[PDB]
Design a protein around this ligand. Structure first.
Ligand code: HEM
Length: 451
């Protein structure tokens, strides 16, 4: 099996001592091909990049979700929430069954009004800019997506658009995820030099956990008859065990949904707008759909479902830059991958989603081009070729929520504004386990359509 350059007794570990590890891993994959071994002290994994091999890795009878080294570190705050629990933990399947009804079609129609509430605040912010003022795109998209999960999921208002600086929850969430990414490259984690990093880390987690207490305390005290994600967490019973979630698991789910429910979606909207302003003919086509379909001051749920081309733009943005770029798997038993790489039970794999999404045998030769038309008929895509939301029973539970929000917001953006890439921005991808085009700015000129 191919393997990139090694560093003596540190093996390949120094290759991930960079600000852009995923981007470093993609270039290794370009150099070495569909599979490559990556060793660290006392650790080994195999990075897969081709649909040929990933279609076997997505075989659930042979491989199950692994918690990567990164996810093990985040589990200190995510606990046994849906995202950081093993498939075999009781709390995974319980919460899985209890919370899927929160993403039913009827649940989605119920979220739509509060999504519009936040989308209108975004549009109003941009409409209220003075001449020649610009937009900080990932910053405002994070304002929107954080507020949307807070309100739709928990009837809690982060009021991000009333702030020039990030919400304290996000300040502690980013620093706590920074501490988790730095534990990967640190030899002796229980050494006195990191005594204060750990002090910071645990105070950043109590910031996040104090908000959680408030969301819970205000639901119990509230009179309003709510039917949202928190309703199901507090009241839903698992049809299989007959049990509801317990108090400590509930806290983990709230923290999980608040973080997983906004970061990757903000990344998606950021990349989508980036590709639109870089591809003016695509932007014009998407804008024409938005104008044709969104005939009312606020979009209906049905109208969002009719934004076919906008949906295609979002999928094409997810192909080039899947915002959660790598997922980890482990072999359920001894097995042979691709008829030439034998694996033993427990052997770990990493699916490099951006490399899978550039497989020339599936997508053709123009893999770097932004062409939404490749999603004209989504059924034409072979199995396991397009995986921005993961695999099987461990796939993203919030997929339809993220895509409905992103389609709604992007449709309104295209309806209400013309956009200008006034700095001719140079794509610079920031990695914090998720991806975002750092420093992306635009100018918007309103088409002066009332809300
Ligand atoms: C474009 C936006 C999103 C992307 C690209 C994305 C990506 C993913 C991926 C790749 C996984 C599988 C993780 C793994 O295999 O380790 C996943 C799982 C998950 N996502 Fe998302 N996600 C997005 C939005 C959301 C939203 C909006 C929510 C909540 C409302 C959410 C909540 C979760 C949860 C709880 C899981 C774990 C599910 C389980 O294992 O049962 N995500 N997501």
């Amino acid at each position: 099996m191919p393997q990139p350059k090694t560093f003596g007794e540190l093996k390949n570990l120094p290759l991930l001592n960079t600000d852009k590890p995923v981007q470093a891993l993609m270039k290794i994959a370009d150099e070495l091909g569909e599979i490559f071994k990556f060793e660290a002290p006392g650790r080994v994994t195999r990075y897969l990049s081709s649909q040929r091999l990933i279609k076997e890795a997505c075989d659930e009878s042979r491989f199950d979700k692994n918690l990567s080294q990164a996810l093990k570190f985040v589990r200190d705050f995510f606990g046994d929430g849906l995202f950081t629990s093993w498939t075999h933990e009781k709390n995974w399947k319980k919460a899985h069954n209890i919370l899927l009804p929160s993403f039913s079609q009827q649940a989605m129609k119920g979220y739509h009004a509060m999504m519009v509430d936040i989308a209108v605040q975004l549009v109003q912010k941009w409409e209220r800019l003075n001449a020649d003022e610009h937009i900080e795109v990932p910053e405002d998209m994070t304002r929107l997506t954080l507020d949307t999960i807070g309100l739709c999921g928990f009837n809690y208002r982060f009021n991000s658009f009333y702030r020039d600086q990030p919400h304290p929850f996000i300040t502690s969430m980013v620093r706590a995820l920074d501490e988790a990414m730095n534990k990967l490259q640190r030899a002796n984690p229980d050494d006195p030099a990191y005594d204060e990093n750990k002090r910071q880390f645990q105070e950043d987690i109590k910031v996040m956990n104090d908000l959680v207490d408030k969301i819970i305390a205000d639901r119990k005290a509230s009179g309003e008859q709510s039917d949202d994600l928190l309703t199901h967490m507090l009241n839903g019973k698992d049809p299989e065990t007959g049990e509801p979630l317990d108090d400590e698991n509930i806290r983990y789910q709230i923290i999980t949904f608040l973080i997983a429910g906004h970061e990757t979606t903000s990344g998606l909207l950021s990349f989508a707008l980036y590709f639109l302003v870089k591809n003016p003919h695509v932007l014009q086509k998407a804008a024409e759909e938005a104008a044709r379909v969104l005939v009312d001051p606020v979009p209906s749920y049905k109208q969002v479902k009719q934004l076919k081309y906008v949906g295609m733009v979002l999928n094409e943005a997810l192909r080039l830059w899947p915002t959660f770029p790598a997922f980890s798997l482990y072999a359920k038993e001894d097995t042979v991958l691709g008829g030439e790489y034998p694996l033993e039970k427990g052997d770990e794999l990493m699916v490099l989603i951006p490399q899978l999404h550039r497989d020339k045998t599936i997508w053709g030769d123009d893999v770097e081009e932004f062409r939404p038309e490749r999603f004209e008929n989504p059924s034409a895509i072979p199995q396991h070729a397009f995986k921005p939301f993961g695999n099987g029973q461990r796939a993203c539970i919030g997929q339809q929520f993220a895509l409905h929000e992103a389609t709604l917001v992007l449709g309104m953006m295209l309806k209400h504004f013309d956009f200008e890439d006034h700095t001719n921005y140079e794509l610079d991808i920031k990695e914090t386990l998720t991806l975002k085009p750092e420093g992306f700015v635009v100018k918007a000129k309103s088409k002066k359509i009332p809300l």
